[PDB]
A paper describes a structure:
Glycolyl-CoA carboxylase (GCC) is a new-to-nature enzyme that catalyzes the key reaction in the tartronyl-CoA (TaCo) pathway, a synthetic photorespiration bypass that was recently designed to improve photosynthetic CO2 fixation. GCC was created from propionyl-CoA carboxylase (PCC) through five mutations. The enzyme forms an α6β6 dodecameric complex, where the β-subunits arrange in a central core of two trimeric layers, while the α-subunits sit on top of the core and face outward. The biotin cofactor that is essential to catalysis is covalently linked to a lysine residue in the BCCP domain of the α-subunit and acts as a flexible arm that transfers the carboxyl group derived from HCO3– between the active sites of the α- and β-subunits.
Residue numbers in the entry:
A (entry chain B), B (entry chain A): 5 to 510
C (entry chain F): 5 to 170
D (entry chain G), E (entry chain J): 455 to 666
Amino acid sequence: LEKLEERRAQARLGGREKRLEAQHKRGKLTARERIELLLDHGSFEEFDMFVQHRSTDFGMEKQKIPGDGVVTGWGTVNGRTVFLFSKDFTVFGGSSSEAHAAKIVKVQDMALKMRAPIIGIFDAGGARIQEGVAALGGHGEVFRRNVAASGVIPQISVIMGPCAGGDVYSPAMTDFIFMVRDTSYMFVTGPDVVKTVTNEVVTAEELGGAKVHTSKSSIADGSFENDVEAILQIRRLLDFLPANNIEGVPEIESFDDVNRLDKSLDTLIPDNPNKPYDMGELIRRVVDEGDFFEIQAAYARNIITGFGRVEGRTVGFVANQPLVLAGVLDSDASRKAARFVRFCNAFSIPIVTFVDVPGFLPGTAQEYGGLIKHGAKLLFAYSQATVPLVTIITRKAFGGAYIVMASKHVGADLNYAWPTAQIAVMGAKGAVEIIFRAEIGDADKVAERTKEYEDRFLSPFVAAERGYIDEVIMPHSTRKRIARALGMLRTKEMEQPRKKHDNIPL
Amino acid sequence: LEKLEERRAQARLGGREKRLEAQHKRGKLTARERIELLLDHGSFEEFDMFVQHRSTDFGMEKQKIPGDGVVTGWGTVNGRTVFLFSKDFTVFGGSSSEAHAAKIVKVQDMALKMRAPIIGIFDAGGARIQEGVAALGGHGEVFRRNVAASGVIPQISVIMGPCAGGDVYSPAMTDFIFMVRDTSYMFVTGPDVVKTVTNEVVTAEELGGAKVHTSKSSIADGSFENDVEAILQIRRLLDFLPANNIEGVPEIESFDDVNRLDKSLDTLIPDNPNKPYDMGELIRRVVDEGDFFEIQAAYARNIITGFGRVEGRTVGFVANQPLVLAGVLDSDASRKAARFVRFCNAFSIPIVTFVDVPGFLPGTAQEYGGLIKHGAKLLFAYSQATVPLVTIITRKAFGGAYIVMASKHVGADLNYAWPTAQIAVMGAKGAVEIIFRAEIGDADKVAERTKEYEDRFLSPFVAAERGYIDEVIMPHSTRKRIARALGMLRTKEMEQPRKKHDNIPL
Amino acid sequence: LEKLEERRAQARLGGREKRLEAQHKRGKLTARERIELLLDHGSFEEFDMFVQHRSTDFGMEKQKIPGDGVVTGWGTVNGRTVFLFSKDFTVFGGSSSEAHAAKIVKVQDMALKMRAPIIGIFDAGGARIQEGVAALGGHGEVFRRNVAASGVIPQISVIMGPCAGG
Amino acid sequence: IAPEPEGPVAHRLAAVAAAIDHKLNIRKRGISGQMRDPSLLTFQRERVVVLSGQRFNVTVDPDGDDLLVTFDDGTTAPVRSAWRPGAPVWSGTVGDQSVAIQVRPLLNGVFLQHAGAAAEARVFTRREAELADLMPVKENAGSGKQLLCPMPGLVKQIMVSEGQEVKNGEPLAIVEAMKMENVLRAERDGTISKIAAKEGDSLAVDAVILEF
Amino acid sequence: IAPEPEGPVAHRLAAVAAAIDHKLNIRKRGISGQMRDPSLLTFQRERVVVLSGQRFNVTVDPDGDDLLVTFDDGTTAPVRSAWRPGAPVWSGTVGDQSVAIQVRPLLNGVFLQHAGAAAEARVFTRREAELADLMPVKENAGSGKQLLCPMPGLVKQIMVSEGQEVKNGEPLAIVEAMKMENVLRAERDGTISKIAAKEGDSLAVDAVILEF
Ligand SMILES: CC(C)(COP(=O)(O)OP(=O)(O)OC[C@H]1O[C@@H](n2cnc3c(N)ncnc32)[C@H](O)[C@@H]1OP(=O)(O)O)[C@@H](O)C(=O)NCCC(=O)NCCS
Ligand SMILES: CC(C)(COP(=O)(O)OP(=O)(O)OC[C@H]1O[C@@H](n2cnc3c(N)ncnc32)[C@H](O)[C@@H]1OP(=O)(O)O)[C@@H](O)C(=O)NCCC(=O)NCCS
Ligand SMILES: CC(C)(COP(=O)(O)OP(=O)(O)OC[C@H]1O[C@@H](n2cnc3c(N)ncnc32)[C@H](O)[C@@H]1OP(=O)(O)O)[C@@H](O)C(=O)NCCC(=O)NCCS
Ligand SMILES: *C(=O)CCCC[C@@H]1SC[C@@H]2NC(=O)N[C@@H]21
Ligand SMILES: *C(=O)CCCC[C@@H]1SC[C@@H]2NC(=O)N[C@@H]21
């Protein structure tokens, strides 16, 4: 029937040609263009194309656009099943109505039932004001399904436009949030209400723009230049992730060699203890082909999280970054690493940790901000993990920070150390000041005590003698040791005690 | 044998008579006195009384004190088995050594195996500097057992002295932290290092005192005047809590009547919508005998969490407080309520929620602080819970805040509303300004439309017609309806999908 | 660093050259030679090479030998993961101390966690007399691991020397 | 300041506190989940009643439904009442004399008012009383002579005048924020020295409103 | 500024980019867990190569080990190399001429340098190229001609002077915080007007060090 094709073409128009032209003039793709770019060619099957809202308040009965402002369906990304929904900004500003939320709920239920990833593309305005509390009920159903799917299937949210009001809480409960720079923003309350209440004049970009949520608020996991780059990076990320919490990490044929040595790593650690180095260089020289998908790269840059591949299999990486804040652990880095470790453990992704940390960040700002619980979050995530854990200490591991950074005491499977590792309670000077507090009023005796303590304890060998370090390895064999360790540890079987859930501090 | 009794008496002295006298001169009890006060008379059995350290560094071999700075064992509180450890401040400043941590690990393992609560009493210094990385390893073992026991047995930490360095992370992962005012403090980094690094001068009290951790940092769940009051309140809390995640809430004979009506509640809600009221009064008139154990009373006072009894059984309560910040939801209140709800769900404690919330707190400070994820924490906790959930709307429930506050859309079992409830997307003025944005310049028309919207939608009846509210009830029947609902819901059986754990935002 | 390689070479000597020569004169291989012969070429990864005892009784503090009389680790046999430990007869007669038993317990826990076979090579004397009831406690921990792994992973014991007492 | 109980009033208050503590302990000992049978246990009859810095060594003996309280000097004060927890007024007979005591629960005790006298009542065992005697008497630091505004908002009303003496727990000003009023109350005692803000003024946090 | 490719250099760079994209796609199509066998799919031969705002409509045809790249104007250029991802240099023959090309990682593409010319190379399908054409060209903002200190600390060394020309990526000063140095680098191009901070001074967050 030509009438069916005509109705399909009418439904594909969304709001109208003028709305789509405005969307393109903003530099943004349409919802259907985004879906087409995300999925494999010809793989998209659309659900609920002709769904219409049933509201009769405020003259809504005269505006019935098929689809109700969201395009839902499923397809394949690199041949693997994915479910997705893309909000159509041209239809009532992408606002969520009862039928809109019903379509989203259908796609969420299908994704959870089929144990496949679900992708959310957000370019909307929130609950539709004309529909009243029905929109809120639909939002609540979507939230309930987001919580049900958490830790079962990977959930990815892509913010490619406005996201305000109750709309933001659905991406917040997903695993990863990505934003498009200069065209997307997220906030619970809009600039107008902020002005009316707090008398503060702020634009949408200054309130919830990509930079704010990628570098300050810990909300977004990354930002991209435009829609095309963001969607291509989403496709790239999907190739790293397991489809669910059962199938395990995907495998590809690796062009790299697991037995290659990296002689340049033998000179990575500077002789001067005060001289920093780039840990990202070590990570990118360890992973296959130097390919690393970094997570939250712009936020809490004293730590590094991201996905690489070792021998063709996805591996999570956590590493202190000495280039930023001397690589100390603060609240922001602790929360970032904790969430990343929790995700990796929930989906059976092994974690490799590179440790160079002198301790925690001091000050009243950290203590008043809850650094105790925030650091306990990372400690809890590491101690809870049952995936393989391989830890490499490069230069420093002091005290509680050493304990937290996936030490053997919290359940690490293999703990290696470079010859430059320094595993101690604290620095030599402070340890001497505490132990020899009675003779702190000297100049040569204090120096002799400090030198003796440095020679005895500022090394990896006290830990090695206690068995806390499995082996002191040469830096050039790091990748080979990691690959062999992960290959052996693939069969790890461990279980936490039976519980409804843990009580990790929030 | 008289020699055995003499050795026991010598071990009971801890550090020395002078150090015990100095402890008493600070207004603090000794560790053994605190254990005696906590437990039922004659019920304490002590483990590892004669354990001593094996360190030979820095002359430690000449200081071998039995117990190694901690008293461990088990007893009964009101006839119910509890395990406990109390750090002895007179022995090396309470610092944690290898044998010290081994004793703590033994008591933790016993508590987990027996499915009994474990109480930690902290008056210490952290890791013992003279022992090196062995103390860190012991701390790590303690942390691992804290994480393993999370959500299985209730873990209570009582801070009755200094708690510095790596010591603070064990209480941080427990369920509840209580502090003694003017004599206890917690911080990751001490004042001396803070002065050295950040150049600011702070005392121990200013950095980590009881007030800071009860009102600013979200660390402590409460503070008490002295040791005796704190320990008695710990006994009371233990009477409130289940022994493990299997046995359910304890039951006592109630002196109150579940069928009594409270006529005073019919006048609790002021006629003026801008006038607040005390929600704590409603909570204390609903619980048995007006007995309410509030949790985190000094922190995020726009929300209320705590334990009460209905018909002699423990019930958790969450309620917006209109007296503070108009009862809005912000990051602090969201995190507090989320942690409380997670604890209640983990241990099969039903939750009653009183809702009067106009929305979320606006401003750049909230958005930059991550209000999206912090509110998502409470939404996640409510949507995840499988314990009975009873919600009562008193005055206001607007938008996303209405969704989050245990609405039927996120899994609430019974949702009641008072006649003064107002369930809507937003206020009438803003809704009219959005719906009728084209004609905002006509004052009389705007007023007429605002009045019409207020009549139509600022009521509980639109939600009642959609089935979102089970029944609009009289305020004087609130306790009777709650008691009957909980009695019916005791047999609730539901489960989240199979997973290692969720990925709740941190 | 050449110092790390020197420390490894010193740890590989066990008791001393004279003890190893006496071991070879009995027709017996060393513990490391036995491990090398058992595993696929180049597959052995050693745990706790530098572990030493912490005893201070009867002058034991003057005899700190890396490894504490046992070589532990994992490898492959015909490409399949196996865990193993070989007691070094040259180090205190192969006797089991606290750190010795801790290394054995580590390898047993790894074998059980990874669901892989564990091979025990015994050339020893029993519990180290100088390390009191701590040696007995370590033996008990090893026994508990043996019982826990029974019927889950295959456990093979090879007696290549004295095996007495506990 | 309400006077502390003296003589027979103090004895009656101590007897009432002991009876309430006995009733609460008897109910508490019936909790479920105990390791062994609660009946296979003994109750320490000797108690110490601390009554606003005043100690009474008493013995509680249940003579059937009622309770018998015996003091150090040998006097016995039987206690008979039908009071239940949560009831604001304790009504009954203490030593063949009907009495009415206001009961306001507090932490680990009760606040009692009777015959014009008020006192905080706590009941310990002898060991618990001895341990509680080791606790220090902490003094409140008070508050400064400035009334800072705890929240930003618009001042709607001021119920105090210039040079007016106020007591603790008395309203001082009303501040409205986010369409909700907030009644500010005096935390100390002192005449108002100056009023810095009036109606219609928008104030931020930690802003001076009135000075004591 | 490195010149953009033109003529045969541009053609060789486009052919190499197409070959690298083809190799990466062939490896990518072998991922495990696909819904059905990846052999039951088809590769879109038509491709678009964008060399820094320069389009090339090309077709990639697998012919044995080497790859055959055919351009719009009939010309074909076989590509043969043993290059593997992660190798910094692409070595092989394009057409019948040996060539060495630097390959650098890029988001959704590769940065290529050859014969004195450099360009960012992205390979799309025709539909993907059409969609990418809709994306706007965004202009960077820059810095406010001041070197704000990103962290508090003590200034250790300043390697610039007033009235001296600095380019982008040139170090400007070293600031040491918590026993760790931090090398500050210029984010723009210009001359340093004046130097405010001096070696040994302790700065704070958002402190002026020098002006451009
Ligand atoms: C999401 C938001 C930031 C979008 O930014 P914006 O483009 O500058 O705002 P717009 O008015 O142009 O939104 C586009 C359309 O979608 C509509 N819309 C947006 N959000 C909506 C919602 N939650 N419900 C119903 N309609 C909505 C708008 O009415 C508008 O309609 P119009 O083009 O015919 O005039 C903003 O619209 C918003 O916050 N919406 C939530 C509801 C609200 O509070 N609106 C007033 C604040 S401006
Ligand atoms: C916990 C702490 C705040 C206690 O406050 P304090 O009473 O004012 O400090 P004190 O020196 O008096 O501690 C009491 C004793 O316990 C010892 N002690 C405290 N913490 C210790 C530790 N982690 N390891 C070993 N010994 C420790 C102290 O050396 C001291 O010994 P002393 O009485 O013979 O002089 C503080 O001691 C501390 O931070 N300890 C951790 C280690 C440290 O950094 N010390 C230097 C900071 S003051
Ligand atoms: C196991 C055993 C049969 C080995 O046979 P052996 O070679 O003829 O006995 P050795 O004395 O030569 O043992 C070799 C060394 O290991 C030591 N050793 C052996 N078993 C030990 C143990 N359980 N604890 C500590 N040291 C031990 C021996 O002291 C001896 O030391 P040395 O060479 O410096 O003299 C025998 O040593 C034994 O039974 N040891 C257990 C302890 C014991 O009972 N010893 C006395 C019986 S001989
Ligand atoms: C000297 O400058 C101070 C050295 C001790 C403090 C440093 S700051 C970062 C590390 N974290 C911590 O707690 N101490 C270390
Ligand atoms: C008028 O004064 C402003 C009313 C709308 C803002 C108020 S502030 C607290 C509530 N939260 C929110 O987002 N809006 C409400």
